[PDB]
Amino acid sequence: MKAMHVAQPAVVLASSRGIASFVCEYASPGKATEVRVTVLRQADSQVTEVCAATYMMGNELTFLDDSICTGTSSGNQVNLTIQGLRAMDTGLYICKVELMYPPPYYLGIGNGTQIYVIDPE
Amino acid sequence: MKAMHVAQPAVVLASSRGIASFVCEYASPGKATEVRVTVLRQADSQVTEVCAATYMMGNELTFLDDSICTGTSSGNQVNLTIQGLRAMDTGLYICKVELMYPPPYYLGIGNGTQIYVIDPE
């Protein structure tokens, strides 16, 4: 596991419809085979998992049935939406982003060593 | 698969005991979980596999039972020996080196977005 910075807006005001949107950006190396986003909520020191989705870099996010969250990946971004919010749902919403890549594999082929063996008697 | 250069001596003279030794160097990225060396022989255009061994970077090589080949890995090197050679065993001996690494995995944890939700009436 290598650490990765994730940036997101410090504060967001949910609309009167109770829809809140924010972006979580990160500095990835390249095209991750997998990318898994998880939103956690902190209030009263208690941390809960609000939602989780997995997808391939570029391909669209999709959360579990009737999720609070909607999502859209565009490059080194995930654009989260969270709906149905009410007053008591105020708190700190944290992005956890996992990127997974294929195992490196190197093949080297040498030019050859001509081995000469003596025929004695 | 990424290509990798492998260098080895152009010519080697087997001793009167029929023991021939050569080094196959390569430019690897780092500590490969796996490293697999394979020696191929070319004569009359025909290519045969003379021997194969697998090991971890640093840890010692060991070939199949009663192998022609003996081996020792030291950094970015494999030091091959080949014994029991006779005249007809003259030919081009090629190093094939495979390096395998673990799948990259990045975890990013955001600082959080404080979401404020309005209590209406």
Residue with tokens 């955001």: B110
Answer yes or no: is A119 within a domain: no
Domain count, chain A: 1
Q: Provide the resolution (angstroms).
A: 2.6
B-proximal residues of A, 61-120, CB under 8 Å: 82, 85-87, 89-120
B50: left (phi over 0), alpha (psi -120 to 50) or beta: alpha
Q: Which of B33, B106, B3 is nearest to A32 (CA)?
A: B106
CATH of the domain at B14: 2.60.40.10
In a domain, B22, yes or no: yes
Q: Is A28 in Cβ contact with B113 (below 8 Å)?
A: no
Residue A114 maps to a domain: no
Is residue B92 situated within a structural domain?
Answer: yes
Q: Could you tell me if residue B30 is inside a domain?
A: yes
Tokens 């609070």 correspond to A68
Residue among B22, B106, B114 whose CB faces A113 most closely: B22
Q: Distance (Å, rounded) from C-alpha A5 to C-alpha B18? A: 59
Q: How far is CA B46 from the centre of its chain?
A: 23
CA distance A61 to A9: 20
Residue A117 domain-assigned (yes or no): no
SS (H, E, C) B65-106: CCCCEEEEECCCEEEEEECCCCHHHCEEEEEEEEEECCCCEE
Residue B107 placed within a domain: no
DSSP characters over A32-62: -SEEEEEEEEEETTEEEEEEEEEE-TTSPP-
Spatial separation of the C-alpha atoms in residues B65 and B46, rounded to whole Å: 24
| Closest in B18, B24, B99 to A110, CB measured | B24
Type of residue at B9: P
Which chain A residues are within 8 Å of B34, Cβ to Cβ? none
| Residue A120 falls inside a structural domain | no
Cα–Cα distance measured from residue B22 to residue B32, given in angstroms and rounded to the nearest whole number: 22
Domain that holds residue A23: 5-101
B46 touches chain A (CB under 8 A): no
Give chain A positions within 8 Å (CB) of B51.
none
